[model samples]
Target chain A: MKYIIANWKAHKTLEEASAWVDSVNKQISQTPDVQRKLEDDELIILIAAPFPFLVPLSQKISQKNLAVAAQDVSVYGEGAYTGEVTAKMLKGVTTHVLIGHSERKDYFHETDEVVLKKSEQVLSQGLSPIFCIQNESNKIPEGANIIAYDPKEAIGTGKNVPGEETATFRKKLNLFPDAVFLYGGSVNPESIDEYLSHPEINGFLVGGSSLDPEEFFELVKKL
Target chain B: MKYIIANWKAHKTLEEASAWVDSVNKQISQTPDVQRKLEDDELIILIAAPFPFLVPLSQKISQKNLAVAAQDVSVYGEGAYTGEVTAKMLKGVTTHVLIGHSERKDYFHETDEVVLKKSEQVLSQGLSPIFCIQNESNKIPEGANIIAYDPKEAIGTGKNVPGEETATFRKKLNLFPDAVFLYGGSVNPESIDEYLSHPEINGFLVGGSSLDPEEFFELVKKL
Candidate 1:
């Protein structure tokens, strides 16, 4: 089974979010047996919406094949950490949580220690963590079922991770031999086939292009 | 007009959030001319809800008098910030953004430079800022509309700030002479009158006690 996860990040408002769901649902509806395929786990589509939009998007989404995720999760559980979103609060609304994305490590100074703690918190709530790592320096927390290889140089720079780099990354990531693998950073339909051909690369975690309904439609149609 | 802001911090589920609104509404409804008072700006009631609950609470609320707020806003704007919520995305849903919160400073290592940047970003989006401070060490940004005096020692300890401490703080906060003043830190109905006695302190910013409808009812009664 292959997965296509859209990390909406900090983009979009309530109106834009609603429109994305409507547009994407319509796009996927045209495909033959999309729902059946989704149910069969042949292809999975998850939208990692920003915190504020999670509940609204989860309730608004009509497609049973589609799953929801939180853009990030608090390192701590439900408690008095102002401005932080706990994994416990997101249990019913989200199936996954995006942790240690490159932007978080670079901009927010998220470390491996904190990332491990956050992954543990997410797991405790029975929610999966789509734990992201740039390279071997980033630690894969034990019990992390899903791992995304998001190269820092490739993120938001239009510099897509090449076939050679991915092969090396997969070798370095052998510690998590059984974990589901996905490639992220500058991924659009045009740049997806290279990663798709790799036996170990299971799916995609798209960034900017995922924001546009037409682009999302194009990418999902190919899947 | 006095400000009575409830900083829910990192608390409540969607069920709890909805219940809070229902009970708080019932409490305020019984007060004589409460709606008129809110509308006339005699007293303002604002809820600084966690991110996921903001829009739902905003939509669920029947009281037209209550204003919504985001407990925190991203230092960056609308872009490729994986888990950060920006002030731009919150323009319609939130009237104010909580900045320089002690928990954020301690947990997230939020510096004064970043706090000022966030304040400017919030102001640019036409949203007000409830910038919090522990002492004179925490710098107040230019054009700050409201200031929350949250003593670190008093926070979560129930050792509410005393008259002597507040008297000294009043002198330290002379830079923002015209800014609206509100005292925070273990505030509840029982301990509110001491702060209320001060001519300069406009109202209160309740922390943990703000989670309870009964506590809120009593506090609002005093106001």
Candidate 2:
């Protein structure tokens, strides 16, 4: 199974997002056996947009194959954290969420403890958290269900960590036998094959490239 | 000129929010001098809804008197802070943003320095930031355009700081002569007059009471 995740970091208005979803859905519907393959769990598509778009985009697509995810969830529950959005608020809106992405850690100073707590909070709400692991060396929380390895060195640098390094990283990551592993550093259609060809890598979490409807559709078609 | 702000912290879905705006608009329109008063800058109403509803709600209540605001803005500009909503993103949607609200300062541990940076960011984007002061003694960032004094001990506790205390507090807050001062701690229609009567206090920043259409309408009517 391949999970192609699109993390649109702080972008798009309602009209822009609606149009993107329309184009993607049109292409996805036209593809032969796309819905059937989705049901069979052969290929999963996840869109992690900004906090505002999650519910609306989910309602817009209304496709069983396409899963909607929040970029982040508050460590605190439903209460007084003024601007923060909680996992509970996302109950009916999202099936998945990204936790401790490299950008969140680097920019927001999210500690390992905070990340772990956020993951727990998401899981408690019956949502799968895509726990982002910056490096193979960082400690993987015991209950992390899905992990995306986004090495700090490669992110947004238009650089790819070679397959050999990823293979070794995957071996070290295998300590969590039950967890699904994905590679997510500068992933695009050009580099997707190399990452997917690795025996231990389960999927690709594309960032900037995912924003382009045509490019993203090409990647999906290739898959 | 005074600003009556509503910080709907972590509350209101689309339907609930739409109805609340509808009720407020209908009442405001019925008032003979509402539009005239707004144009003369006698009163300005600002609704700070959660991020998801900002653009839509702003579009819905397209009244000049009733402006829109975001509860918080990212200290960082528009890039990869996953869950963050930047000031630039709210360009067409809102002209005002809240910074360092008591709830945000308490739960999110947003330091005074962080609040300052956020205010700067908001100002850079040509938006006014309602910098929340939890105490009279707390440091006020020098360039803050609007400041809401919401004492930590009084917030959401059904306790309004007495007139004498607020008077003395107001005197102290007057050190920043350039900034507009608003009071916001458990303020309701019954308590609005008392807060407004203070010579130095410009207006009220209502929380829970603002969620109730009838109570909020009454508060607005009394103003």
Candidate 3:
């Protein structure tokens, strides 16, 4: 009933990614209950990886609940857009698309407007958008059923979002009452229980800790 | 060797990409002399494919001269940047990184300054950057030896750069005497000869026509 979405941001080669997937699959096979739990929607684990690793890792997945997600998608449709992977191109590879992550927003100039356009593309392909927003002013695209709240000034500092900020973020979630809310800043196995304790927080969007198979499984196993 | 770099921009599924690679490799194995000519650098063929196809197609290469290239590389180095494939991550898989393709420049907001930074990332990883520029005002990075000239106003229009304009472009080449120049814009086998006639054009950066394996080889076989 909880989510452990791993965001392997620009990390891992094909061999390394395969090994990580193998480790997870190995663990799942050993514990048949984990497989049944995944199928029963008790624990959902999605791995959002670099574009290059999508198919190879997706093929390596042996569990039904363990799925691959594209880290990003092109706003444009098929044709002429060199250096982009269109959402349509990702149809069979993944049903989940990670959008508007801070790194893309700040470094790649993905405006809220661009995020909406990209979300529309993802939805049009019948895929779900795991849309991320840092501030309350950020726009949420229609039909984006999953929203990950990223703290504006608290990312990458190994600091959780201040307790005072969660009240406002929970209030904002009231707008998307049907949405699955995920908390993503400074999350690790040690701090995950605190995040899950909040009834408003339905899942976790993990980053650094997810790169290591053992660390990621620790968070998953505990859940 | 004249380069026939196929820029498969935002196209092809995993199965489609595998089939395209199969067709190209099948042809090479059939005509083993083509393999010899390629090894001698008579015609260097590069496929600037989507990120997902990089590892799969790279593994399928039947000829050393036929290599895979990343359509784009991240401007940032190894940390915290979500949804990006860093140039260092591309090591061992590919040596060619397509930088500043018109689509990336126009759609993805790759500024000349950003392209310079990306080129530095690619070069630092012991990779080669097929850097592109549209006008004489564009900045050339110090060590980027492969420069692609995309004629502004002439791209995607199926119209070649006017005869009068190329004279100025040729003059610009005098600045980077050591650089190998490439032309990209409305290129196909029909118009391939005229572009090859120019001594300044050391190679071709192709789009549109490159998606079709048969069409791409027509251009390659002639070269």
Candidate 4:
């Protein structure tokens, strides 16, 4: 199944998040084609909420046809790093982490070196890294990597990079040829279809469009 | 009254935070001598907890004469600044913000210029900025008034600046010459007495030692 992840980073209220999850789950489950695809392992949906809501949201959505993830985690387990969230701290509450997103890289000063260490840390904790990559010049290492070939420019700007560009960008991560690579940043339902059938593109880690239930579902169906 | 803030940056669980607040409330309230002193409003307590527990923690302590504040807030309102807590976002839940803390400046890439903008923003929205000054050399503009200094060298490392250093930092600001300046960073009760005699060092922004109810109570009583 191509795994589609939505980062509702600090956007949804608890009520909004729960309502959206229920509405989306209902729509996908009621659609025979969608349910069949999801059940047959051709599609999967994951949502990441802010830290404080992580536990409650994880519990609330535990039985749903979706995975719960953390938007970020600290490099240190638990130490003097103030304001840093830890992998162990999120163990029971999160199954994956959105690491090295451009926002963290550019605004939060997360460098590729830090991203590599954090990715290694996440993997060691037995969680997945939704690693966001920007510079195509930096070789994407191989492995069981869940990489996101997202141009930093496209994020939060509502402009999707063309499908051909997305394919080339994913190829830059020289990790395992079959390792899953998700496209992120400004991906909408309209722009997502163009990425299908491209061998290197596996799925998407959507941003602004992910908050819109209909747009998110259409993007998921593209999987 | 001076605002004595404890900014437990991403530290402690909700349960632990609740427990600490409970202990602090009991100790501060039961001591009528302290309570009478508090009536003068010359000293107050502010706990800037991690964003998630701000409401509960604030509410818990408010009953005991403590005010609740946020450790940080998003420069942007509630929408797009992923994982950021903003002043507007904290309405009805919090009364203050620990803006421009040294840790944010040293580790989180928050610059003085950015801090200035945040101070302006916080005041524009009618929230108090518990300004954290790391070095005495840092600048403080006029409209951006009312602040507290937590020396960078002494924070969390268990070492405190000498009494003279604390006095000089207060003089630098020149706002309320008798202004309350908090000596933060690694201040244990044992180290605070010498600072009390210094006319400029009015109080503290307790961290490590503040976690213990007894220690915090004893320290505040000495103040």
Tens-place lDDT digits, model 2, residues B62-178: 677797788898887777667777777766468888888888777778888888888888888888888888875567767676888887778888899886677678677635665
Instruction: Tell me how far the alpha carbon of residue A60 in candidate 2 is from the true structure, in angstroms, after superposition.
Output: 3.8
Span of ten consecutive residues with least summed lDDT in model 2 chain B: B170-179
How many clashes does each candidate structure show, in the order listed?
0, 0, 1, 15
In candidate 3, chain A reaches a TM of 0.94
Off by over 4 Å in 2: A12-19, A22-41, A62-64, A136-143, A174-178, B12-41, B59-64, B136-143, B164-179
Task: lDDT winner between 1 and 3, please give it.
Answer: 1
Write down the TM-score for model 2. 0.86
The superposed Cα distance between candidate 2 and the true structure at residue B192, in angstroms, equals 2.5
List runs of model 1 lying over 4 Å from the truth. A164-168, A171-177, B164-168, B171-176
Candidate models: Cα lDDT each: 0.84, 0.79, 0.82, 0.70
- What are the TM-scores, per candidate, against the unseen true structure? 0.95, 0.86, 0.93, 0.80
> Candidates sorted by TM-score, descending order?
1, 3, 2, 4
Better of 1 and 3 by TM-score: 1
DockQ of 1: 0.77
Relative to the unseen true structure, what is the C-alpha lDDT of residue B89 in candidate 3, on a scale of 0 to 100? Answer: 81
- Please, what are the lDDT tens digits per residue for candidate 2 over residues A1-223? 7788888787776667778899889988888777677778888899887766665677787667787788888897766567877777666567888888888888778888899889888988888888888875566677777888987778888888987788678788735765688888888888777776676887777888888877987887766
**Model 4, span B166-221: residue lDDT tens:** 77767877476644566677777788776878766766777787767788788778
What lDDT does model 2 reach? 0.79
- List-wise, what DockQ does each model earn? 0.77, 0.48, 0.71, 0.26
Displacement of the residue A73 alpha carbon in candidate 4, Å:
3.3
Between prediction 2 and prediction 4, the one with superior lDDT is: 2
